[PDB]
């Protein structure tokens, strides 16, 4: 038996206890799971645009209260009259106001300038903040697509445009979509694609802190795995200073003299703040950087106070005490509170009495009482997420900043206790045995008081290892505009010239995993931080030096094309193998797959360079029985290297023997299968040579069709002006003599046999004998394009006959690449050691459809890991969707704070028929459609609206799309379908269709 009830009722007790230990840590994660503050974006009064430039305002004691905005078309003359009760006048003669809420980047997001004109400056800045708070957490803002990620913005209605009843001229249907705190949380969750609860909060001076409360509990419960809490009060009208002044509450200076005897009113400021909140478990499991940790947030109302405006004492204590209880802390656990400190001669006394009650009553050390509004002004609904950022910087800098205008501690408050030390000098706040905790209070004008507790981030980040590597990881940067590309290279040179010594692998991991892939890319593989800040000083002007630049919208899947003979050099793979674990492993694998059939092990033949490959009656890998197996060894290893750094194929195109690598990498044949196949095709092809030869020439193919003869006929169409012809020595040498005198140079390939002709079938006997049926054709892993039928086909036809057939008929490489272009793909990596025929598919793209992208791996006499970092550079820059979590899968790379996107801001402020002559008609309708587009898009500068950008990324929503189709149905007088904007996503496509609808 089981030791009756001694080893049983005690075996059920280690479950009923170990289930109680896991059903009680679910209750401590449903109520008090500490949420992280993964990133912080802020646009605050003064020059503040980053949470780092705010620490240069909070640490050197600068007040951002400068003056009223002149950008915004505010009267500024009726706002000020000696009569303090004149309707329409304001009482504060300044305040910390944003100098950049007037400007915005519309084309960056899916917004038309006309729609971005109607967008409230509250949401317009929240869009740029939502991007910053994601680019600052190392989260690509486009990777958060269809993801559970709440957006909790806290705003105030205010008044921006023209009263909706009267509408507008260009802003007619978008006026509503601009003046609505409703879409001021949904607009953000639409542009980024977030599928989390996007709620807007209205509690006035507590909106932000109440929004972090709602976000904290959407992470405690789990409704959203990520949240962007945050509040904005950009005031586009002086209405608030005119109505906050009729109650006589604004400070005549606009300064929030927090807890000071000279408080002559509450003052004001405009601003915005956003926090990326994630529960600590998820934040540290996914690797997201934790700055500080929101532990407990409480939200209460003042109740029946002395009016709707006047604060309440007991209610404030009940939320400063509910936050501590809900976080599991005590009054003595908090080291520095960041009180509201609104600035009113009434609010501050009751507020401090509340802080002397919830903390000061039981204090061991004096509470460091502060207020961000002293340095900034009352940012209203941005106050609370300005205070959480000032506390999260105070912890992240080990200093608590000063509360400006607090030298004369208020006489109406009893500071005799000493339990509260008003921060008038920067008091050091160092990391120690106690976790550094703080508390941020926002008490709104609506009566709802909120108090949040912010612990320091648990210092478990330490423990990182160190190392060095030869991988020159591409520093990939990208922007939505060519000028944003030259300013994302200038704001990084500055960050790497003003934040010096940041490991180059750490700036390549952060720019790659943490920056969205935007449709203007630049990529360079640095070897130093002066060959990078010289490239980041040429990419700032536009000069592509040592880098790769490319406009690559609508490009996400690459194809692998496989060149034949041409890299006779074959002395660049040594370099890659020596520096690449993967190229020194895949090459070994394919060689040891080749040796069982062809004894030649490639690696010794590989250290042998061509400088060491011409003594014993030899040339630059002219032995077919030796070049073809080692060619394959290099090709499959290069294709495995490219797939090892994250680039996977979409289609496959193999010129002559690249078919065999089509077999291998696309899964249709194994390494042994394809190795045997090429090795066996090799020996057979090595018995014919001595009488045939291939002759690549740009020679007109509709002209060498008559030259077909003397046994020399076309073996491959490698582009429009690219023809590989194959035959014996009859026309072979006379081609060169009778051609090169008329600017047509015959590149007589250094080969000795003929393929894709009737010469291959002379070894049909041995080709079908020495291939065997053992490399059974298998449905593989990648689509593939046959260069014998010239068709996208199945991967189940690659057998012995298939190799014969491929070596029998014309390759038609040109037809294959054009079928690629028309099929849906547009980018092709010439996997090879030297990209021969590079400008051949570029030739294909120049005379047909759109120009194609010729990315290539190595070159003749270029095989270093530096040239492979440049290969990945030109691949990213040309559109190829490299995965950068594989190139940096392990290199000792850690996230580094980097400059966010350089939004190219322009002032967007809302104040209260052709008789078929020629293709000249094509470009004339093209221009007509563009002009009617950049008149329903509100592009006052009709000049240009990107031709490669879609009708869903230029803000061509209903209104724009419908009026556009109506403008075209009147100017061209046509009947465009209702869903035309969806039928033709591009202005190029729309213009082509309209000029094609002539009859």
């Amino acid at each position, epitope marked *: 038996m089981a030791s009756t*009830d001694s080893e049983k009722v005690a075996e059920y007790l280690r*479950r009923a206890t170990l289930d109680l230990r896991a059903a009680r840590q679910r209750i401590r994660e449903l109520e008090g799971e500490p949420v992280a503050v993964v990133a912080m974006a802020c646009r605050l009064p003064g020059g503040v645009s980053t949470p780092e430039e705010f620490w240069e305002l909070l640490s050197e004691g600068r007040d951002a209260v400068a003056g009223l905005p002149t950008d915004r078309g505010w009267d500024l003359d009726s706002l000020f009259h000696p009569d303090p009760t004149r309707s329409g006048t304001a009482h504060q003669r300044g305040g910390g106001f944003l100098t950049e809420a007037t400007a915005f980047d519309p084309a960056f997001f899916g917004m038309s300038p006309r729609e971005a004109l109607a967008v409230d400056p509250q949401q317009r800045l929240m869009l740029e903040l939502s991007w910053e708070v994601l680019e600052r957490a190392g989260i690509p803002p486009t990777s958060l697509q269809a993801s559970p990620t709440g957006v909790f913005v806290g705003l105030i209605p205010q008044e921006y445009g023209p009263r909706l009843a009267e509408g507008g001229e260009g802003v007619e249907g978008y006026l509503m979509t601009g003046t609505t705190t409703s879409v001021a949380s949904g607009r953000i969750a639409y542009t980024l694609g977030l599928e989390g609860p996007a709620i807007s909060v209205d509690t006035a001076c507590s909106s932000s802190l109440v929004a972090v409360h709602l976000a904290c509990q959407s992470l405690r419960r789990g409704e959203s795995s990520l949240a962007m809490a945050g509040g904005v009060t950009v005031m586009p009208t002086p209405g608030m200073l005119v109505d906050f002044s009729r109650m006589n509450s604004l400070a005549p200076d606009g300064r929030c003299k927090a807890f000071s005897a000279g408080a002559n009113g509450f003052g004001m400021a405009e601003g915005a703040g956003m926090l990326l909140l994630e529960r600590l478990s998820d934040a540290r499991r996914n690797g997201h950087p934790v700055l500080a940790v929101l532990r407990g947030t409480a939200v209460n109302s003042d109740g029946a106070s002395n009016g709707l405006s006047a604060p309440n004492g007991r209610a404030q204590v009940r939320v400063i005490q509910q936050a501590l209880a809900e976080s599991g802390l005590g009054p003595a656990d908090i080291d520095a509170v960041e009180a509201h400190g609104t600035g009113t001669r009434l609010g501050d006394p009751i507020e401090a009495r509340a802080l002397f009650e919830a903390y000061g009553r039981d204090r061991e050390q004096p509470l460091h009482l502060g207020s961000v509004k002293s340095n900034l002004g009352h940012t209203q609904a941005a106050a609370g997420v300005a205070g959480v950022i000032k506390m999260v910087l105070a912890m992240r800098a080990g200093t608590l900043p000063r509360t400006l205008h607090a030298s004369e501690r208020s006489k109406e408050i009893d500071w005799s206790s000493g339990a509260i030390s008003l921060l008038d000098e920067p008091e050091p706040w160092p990391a120690g045995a106690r976790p550094r905790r703080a508390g941020v209070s926002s008490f709104g004008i609506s009566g709802t008081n909120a108090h949040a507790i912010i612990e320091e981030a648990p210092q478990v980040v330490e423990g990182e290892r160190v190392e060095a590597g030869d991988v020159v990881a591409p520093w990939v940067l990208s922007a939505s505009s060519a000028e944003g590309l030259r300013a994302q290279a200038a704001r990084l040179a500055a960050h790497l010239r003003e934040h010096p010594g940041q490991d180059p692998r750490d700036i390549a991991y952060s720019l790659a995993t943490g920056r969205a892939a935007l449709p203007h890319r630049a990529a360079f593989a640095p070897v130093d931080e002066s060959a990078a800040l010289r490239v980041l000083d040429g990419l700032a002007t536009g000069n592509a030096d040592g880098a790769a630049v490319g406009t690559s919208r609508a490009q996400q899947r690459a194809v692998f094309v496989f060149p034949g003979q041409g890299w006779q050099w074959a002395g660049m793979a040594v370099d890659l193998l020596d520096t690449s674990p993967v190229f020194a492993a895949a090459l070994r694998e394919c060689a040891d797959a080749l040796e069982p059939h062809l004894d030649f092990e490639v690696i010794p033949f590989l250290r042998a360079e061509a400088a060491r490959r011409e003594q014993d009656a030899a040339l630059s890998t002219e032995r077919v029985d030796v070049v073809q197996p080692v060619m394959f060894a290099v090709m499959v290893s290069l294709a495995s290297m490219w797939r090892a750094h994250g680039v996977e194929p979409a289609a496959v195109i193999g010129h002559s023997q690249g078919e065999i690598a089509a077999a291998c990498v696309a899964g249709a044949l194994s390494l042994d299968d394809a190795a045997r196949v090429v090795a066996l095709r090799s020996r057979v092809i090595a018995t014919m040579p001595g009488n045939k030869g291939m002759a690549s020439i740009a020679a007109p193919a509709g002209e060498v069709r008559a030259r077909i003869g003397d046994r020399v006929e076309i073996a491959a169409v490698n582009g429009p002006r690219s023809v590989v012809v194959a035959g014996d020595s009859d026309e072979l040498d006379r081609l060169v003599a009778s051609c090169t005198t008329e600017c047509i140079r015959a590149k007589r390939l250094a080969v000795d046999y003929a393929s894709h002709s009737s010469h291959v079938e002379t070894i049909r006997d041995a080709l079908h004998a020495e291939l065997g049926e053992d490399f059974h054709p298998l449905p593989g892993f990648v689509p593939f394009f046959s260069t014998v039928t010239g068709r996208w086909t199945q991967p189940d036809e690659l057998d012995a006959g298939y190799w014969y057939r491929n070596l029998r008929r014309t390759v038609r490489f040109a037809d294959a690449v054009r079928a690629l272009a028309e099929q849906g793909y547009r980018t092709f990596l010439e996997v090879s050691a030297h990209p021969i025929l590079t400008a051949a598919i570029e030739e294909i793209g120049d005379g047909s459809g759109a120009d194609l992208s010729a990315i290539h791996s190595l070159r003749r006499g270029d095989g270093s890991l530096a040239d492979f970092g440049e290969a990945l550079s030109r691949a990213f820059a040309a559109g190829v969707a490299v995965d950068w979590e594989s190139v940096h899968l392990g290199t000792g790379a850690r996230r580094v704070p980097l400059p966010t996107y350089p939004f190219q801001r322009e002032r967007v402020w809302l104040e209260p028929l052709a008789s078929l002559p020629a293709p000249e008609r094509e470009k004339a309708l093209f221009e007509l459609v563009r002009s009617h587009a950049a008149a329903v898009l509100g592009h006052a500068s009709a000049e240009r609206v990107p031709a490669d950008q879609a009708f869903a990324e230029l803000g061509v929503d209903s209104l724009s799309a419908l009026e556009l189709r109506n403008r075209l149905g009147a100017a061209t007088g046509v009947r465009l379908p209702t869903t035309t904007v969806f039928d033709h996503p591009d202005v190029r496509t729309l213009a082509a269709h309209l000029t094609s609808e002539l009859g």
Partner: antibody
Amino acid sequence: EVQLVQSGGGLVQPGRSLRLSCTASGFTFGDYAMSWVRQAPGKGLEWVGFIRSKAYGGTTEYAASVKGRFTISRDDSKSIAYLQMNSLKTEDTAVYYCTRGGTLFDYWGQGTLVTVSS
Amino acid sequence: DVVMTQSPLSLPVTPGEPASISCRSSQSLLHSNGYNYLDWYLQKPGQSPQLLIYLGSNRASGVPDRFSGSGSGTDFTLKISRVEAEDVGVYYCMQSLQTPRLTFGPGTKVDIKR
């Protein structure tokens, strides 16, 4: 977090020996008497045996089908449970699994397709 | 003697519909403690067996709220209040009163119902 990853399956003949190892990481190995159960292909689970906790002492209770053939051990300092299978026969073609308990099989291994065919 | 436990061996379940596997023991599984010594295990198809319920009614952490347990040692009833594609497989009624236990029982062969 608890896990009971196994190792030691393979192909042998009736009358041979074989080792079954149960790597326990996540819990204090010495606390739970661990069992070894067996799923013959496509039929119900049959319990092979179990070794009692070292703290409890006790003994090693095996089945009637495998007494005198299989022996089960455990080590804390190396934290592995053993099913030593000896004198195998055609019946042992099955997916032996190692569960953390002797009366309450709370956690399980993925199962080792130990096969005994001639 | 030994406790012989039987069940509705071939119980069909249709998704979204509450189902109920039952167990019937020859002897009494309610031990002095006031605790039944019956356990409910799940071997989802081709996976490691899972512990759904211990001591008759208690549910094992990680097992969804769906698997409830109600009844007495003799006549038990595992009650799935919501059968999805995860509430399928073989449900073993496995006693604990007498251990040597050569078998886990025939097990309830659960199937998606049409």
